[model samples]
Structures are given as structure tokens and as C-alpha cells.
Target: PKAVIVAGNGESLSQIDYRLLPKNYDVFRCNQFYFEERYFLGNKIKAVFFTPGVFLEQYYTLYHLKRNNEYFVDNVILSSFNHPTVDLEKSQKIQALFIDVINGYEKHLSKLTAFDVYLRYKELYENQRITSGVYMCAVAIAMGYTDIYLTGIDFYQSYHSKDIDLEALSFLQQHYHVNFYSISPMSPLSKHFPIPTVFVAPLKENYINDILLPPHFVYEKLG
Candidate 1:
């Protein structure tokens, strides 16, 4: 099997500073996908992935455990709605989202754009987290990661320790047909993101499988 590289970007890397050495794997800086030369100028990343919405804390913990260990990552991609926080005038390896998109969003946020309220309303209608998570995955596939794996993607409204809502992740799974899995007692939004994914559980922890749903895969430990 090929080596799997674990990567994290944006606020996802806040607690991952210690995982920066070669053992942790190559770090791709995105600083929340902001437009900074230092974050997105020179990196030759084959693919960029993100988990949109509030996933920084969970992703950060996973990165800390995987970096430089057996589960090192190759490259990381980030997306930001505005300017970068880090200094980037000197670096050229990072890449940035085009300015127009950022400006457009900002305009929408400020109610300067005609469609601002419409867009916000639409977001609310589709379950903001579900819509954004799907959007993020779609972008990753567009960037060319033939085999993509989503982690810490707790789309389920609730988690039953390790049971994933297979019904929820089906949409993206049908689109990519790649390896996918989720930890469950999932959120209702998961009904929109179903895939052939696994739901792993900790070895020592025995939780009730009250839902009677089948999981694609389950493991004793995460690593």
C-alpha cells in the first residue's frame, strides 16, 4: 500500500506547530486560505483538501498525532475569505485564492452585493454545515485527488461514539466512489453526504449500537 500523508490547513494547524519537522511530513501553509505569498506562492501541491465549517480543533488534534509519525501527510490546502494572518512578502511557495472570489464574498457579507441576503438565506436553508462540507469536498475532487479520505467530518447531528450516518454521506460517495468513512450518531445533515464510509470505535470503549445501522468499517483504534 502507498504511504498515507495526513495534512491540515487554516486554523486546523494552530496546535500543530510541534509537528513541523520532516518526520511530521512536509507542511503546506494556507493560513485559512488567505492571499499571502508565504502561504500559497511556491508550493507544488498535487491536491488541496478542506473540511469547511468548524473543524479546526478536531483536525488539529489529528494532525498532532499523525505528523512525523507513521501517518505523515504530504501537502495541505486551506481556503480563507480574506487576507492572510502570517507575513508573506518574502515567501513564494504558497498559493492564494483569486482576489475576485474573496472580494465577492466580502461584498456579500457587507450587504454590498445584491445577492448577499439571498446567498445567506440559501446557506441557512441547506443546513450551512452540510452545504459547506460538500462544497469543500467538491473542490478537493476538482483539484485532482483521485483517492480522498475525509477525517473528523462529523456531519451527523449527534455521534454514537463511532457510528457514522451512512445515509448522510451518500451524495459525495456516489460522486467520487472513493474511500470514505465517518464516526456516528451523526447529525441530520449527514443524510445529505452519504458514502461507503467506515465508522471506527476505540478498543476499550464499548458503546451501544442502538440504531441498528451497519457501518462500512470499524477499527479498534484510530491510528
Candidate 2:
């Protein structure tokens, strides 16, 4: 793929004109939030990723293990699986990939002093643990994607992980030569301002008004 569309949970995603987006870009969606705005459901999605252990933590507890088996084997994309709920003892779990989110941080985002927060976040990441966004960056870097566009991944609600994710984005651009763009100008990422290359469409005002919803769904949302 020429580009990797790493989707996030920013409100702007709901307003995107999918047909107008670069169609050749492969998609790297972040969890079911993208499903909330599911216009891209029938599109050329390459892979669907989840938070570390989501398959184990959420699905295994709330869903069913039998269906989980089918989900894993039926996997057409990168990963899918779920079963069990609340019963840690009897739970069935599976992890298709090892998400060493901290490693991704250390590689690109490993330099930060209390003095840095915005544009200077490019210093690097931390080894303190992992966040789903950092893991996504690490995986994309490993695959050598040329351009990575982030939409709605501003970490507005998940601010705890926002700094780390932004650092990873900067690190990949500087260290690995991945082109980065935040399609949403209202992103928390905009805080860093001129330091990071964020793209705010001149049409932000009209974007939401232009979103084209699908025809078949009754209870539908935007992706």
C-alpha cells in the first residue's frame, strides 16, 4: 500500500468524505470506534487492530469461546477473536500478536524531560508500559509503510496515552522516514503546533456537512 490509514477516535472521522480520500491507502483501523462510523466497512480494509489483550480482556469475558474459535480461524484480516466474560478461571483467551508498545516508544519516543510537551515531544518515547496507539506505530514502522495518516486519534478522552502516541508519531517520522499527517485540525495533536506536520483541511467547516452515509443501515454511525 502507498499509504496506511491509521484511524483514531476523533470526531472529525465522522465528517470524512471517504470516496474523496486517497483510495489506494491501506487501512490500519484502531478498534471498533471505526465501526461506530462504519462507512468504510465494505472498502479495502487491510487489517483491523485492537488494544493489547482486548481479545482476552473484553471478548473472552463478555462473548463466547465457541464463536471465538470461528473468529480466529475465519480471520481474513490481521486479527480477530473473543469469548468469556467475568470468569477469569474459565475464560478462553488468545493473542495473535505480541504488542510490545513500550518497545515502539523506546525506539522512537524515548527522550522526554518535564520541560517538553508539544513540538518538542519529538525527543522520543518511554518504556513505562504500552498504549494501543504506540503499538500501531511500531507495527507500521516494522512493515515499512511510506506514509501514515492519522484521523481522529487525538486522545481527547484517552489523554493519558496522548503524549506517548504523539511522541511515537514524531519518532517514526524523524527516525523511520514515515510521513505523518493528522487530517483533523481540531486534534489534541494540534497543541504541538508548527513542530509536527499536521494537516487541517481548509474545508473543516464544511466537512461534517458533507459526510455521505450508507443506505442499508438503520442504526448506523460514521467511521
Candidate 3:
């Protein structure tokens, strides 16, 4: 299939066997994936999307902790959304070490902004902001992938909340012919959008049980 998967770090990821996903589809991951790259090794991650905050964390991990620099060795596409806090000099340094950086702004392959996507979708629905996972889906679309699948992007629904933009999901599905997928049978995508679900056997391997969070973030689910 000429497809791609916009993988997220929601808790539902633990339910799906990443290795079982078809290898032909390009898989995209979002921030903090480097922290547990072991679980994701089953598929060749095509690109990793980082917002400004996550980019800062990655910079710190590379320069301070001096570990998790695997992106350079694996040759994964390193992309960061455009933000005032994103250090161009740092991106230049990273590019010098590995591959060229793809910015969420300005032209690389295709130039797009979160607001640009959010605004377009807002015309269809409101009270929504574009999350990083959604932007990764947009990037996949911009890269010319005709078939798109999503996994683990639960919008923290397990924590009793869903930051996912239902309208944005609809717009992508209706306008772009994007097919979003989930391992969870009860996800909003399955309920509202009626996206497809894949049921797989429970995982046998013991994987890291940490949650993916932004840098220096206070745990909201703690409450």
C-alpha cells in the first residue's frame, strides 16, 4: 500500500503490536519517540515531528545528557514545527551532523503552518487547536501520501480527555480521503468519525511504561 502511519504516543499504543504493521507504509512518529526508540524499531520510522517545546528537549538531550542521538545514526527525517523559540542555529548544527532539516514554515518540500491547517479546518468546525500529531498527519499529506493511517493518537482520552479536533479529523478524512485507524474500539475516531479499527492480540514483550510528555511539563493527569 502507498500509505503512511502518523503514530502517536497515547496509551493505546501499548495495545497495538507495532511490529505487525505493514512495512511498506511509511510511519511517522511524534515527539519523545527517541526516549523509547526500542519499542518502535519494528518499523522504519520515516520522520519524527517535534514542536518547539519538544525540540528544545531534544536539544538538551543531545547536548546535555549526551544520549538518544540515534536519529543521526538511523537517518530518520528530523522535522520541527516553526516557532519563535526554535533555534535556527541549533537546527543548522543538527543538519551538519546528519540530514537536512525540514521546517514547518518556509519552503522545503512544502511549507505549511499549524494555524494554516487549523484555520482551514475551523471553517468547517471551531474551538480547536492543531496538535503536534495532527500536524504530522498534515505533513504526511503534504508529502503526497494517498493512504494514511493513525495509531496511538488518543488525545489522552484514557486520562478522561481528548484534545483531538474532531472537525479537523473530519476535514482531513473528507477533503483528503485520509483513513484514520485505531487499535482502541472506543476512540472518538471510531465513534464520531467512524474510522476503522484493527484488533490484535495482546503484546507479549515488556515495553517501557512511561508516558510521552512535553519538556518540563507538569503532569496534568496526576490530578
Model 2 Cα lDDT, one tens digit per residue, 1-223: 5677777656766554443356566766555432242443233355445443343333332223224331221112222111122222222222223232222222333343221243233322322333455556556656667766666655655234555666556665666566666555566554653223312332222112222333444225312
The TM-score values for the models, in the order shown, are 0.28, 0.51, 0.60
Between candidates 1 and 2, the one scoring higher on TM-score is 2
- Model 2 lDDT, residue 48, Cα: 45
Cα lDDT of candidate 3 equals 0.53
lDDT of 3 by residue, 1-223 (tens): 4777776777665555444355477667766664453444343466656554345445444433224323432323445433333345655545565444455544432454554666545434543445667667776776677767667777656211254455566766777676565544544454554444333333324433344335444335323
1 or 2, greater by lDDT? 2
lDDT of 2 at 200: 34
Worst 10 residues of 1 by lDDT: 85-94
Q: Whose lDDT is greatest here?
A: 3
Ordered from best to worst lDDT, the candidate numbers read 3, 2, 1
The regions of model 2 sitting more than 4 angstroms off are 17-20, 34-43, 56-127, 190-223
Clashes of each: 39, 15, 0
